[PDB]
Amino acid sequence: VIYQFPDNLWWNEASNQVYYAQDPMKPERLIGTPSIMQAKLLKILCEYHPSPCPNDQIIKALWPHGFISSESLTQAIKRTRDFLNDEHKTLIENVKLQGYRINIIQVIV
DNA sequence: TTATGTAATACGTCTGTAACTTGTTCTTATGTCTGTTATGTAGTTAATATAATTGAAGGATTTTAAGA
């Protein structure tokens, strides 16, 4: 499964790599491999789309086994925003009292 | 003997948690202004009428000022 984001950002879940490319089959500028919980968060954001994911479910998915301090949620999002160079918060948007949504240009299956 | 290659071990270290902190954004409690009704104040009334008032009660002794 291949995911396109704004600004020609391509994420490959099978190989789990994110990079800049005009052609999905030909990486141009490699960003690299996100961490594990980063992959979980990305998959959650891509798996409720078009609808956003409620905070309780992402909380229960990122750290299911132990209830974690709340800040970690937001902090994890920061890194998932930062690794995908989403400085303008255009890849992860936050809808108040609704959750977190991701922007997908297209999916290649 | 000495290269070699595994293995213990100690130290960086990349990343996941969490603390400190601010934006800002929304909600609510409060202080204030304004309009209406109830309260509080005040002035006037034109047959004539012209020295209260109500009790209350078997006290027994002292000392001290006024009156003569």
Å separating the CA of residue A15 from the C1' of nucleotide B31: 65
Which are the contacts of A93, defined by CB distance < 8 A and separation ≥ 6?
A: A100, A101, A102, A103
Q: In chain B, which nucleotides are within 7 Å of a protein Cβ?
A: 15-21
Q: How far apart are the first and last CA of chain A?
A: 5
Cβ contacts, strand B, under 7 angstroms: A 35-38, 62-63, 68-69, 71-72, 75-76, 79
Is the backbone peptide bond immediately before A34 cis, with ω within 30 degrees of 0?
A: no
- Distance between CA A60 and CA A35 in Å, rounded? 18
Structural determination approach: cryo-EM
- Resolution expressed in Å: 2.7
Q: How many CB atoms lie within 10 A of CB A62?
A: 19
Signed CA dihedral, A46, A89, A76, A27: sign only: positive
- Distance between CA A77 and CA A38 in Å, rounded? 8
- Smallest CA–C1' separation from A68, nucleotide: B17
| Contact of A83 with A38, CB cutoff 8 Å | yes
How many residues does this entry show for chain A?
109
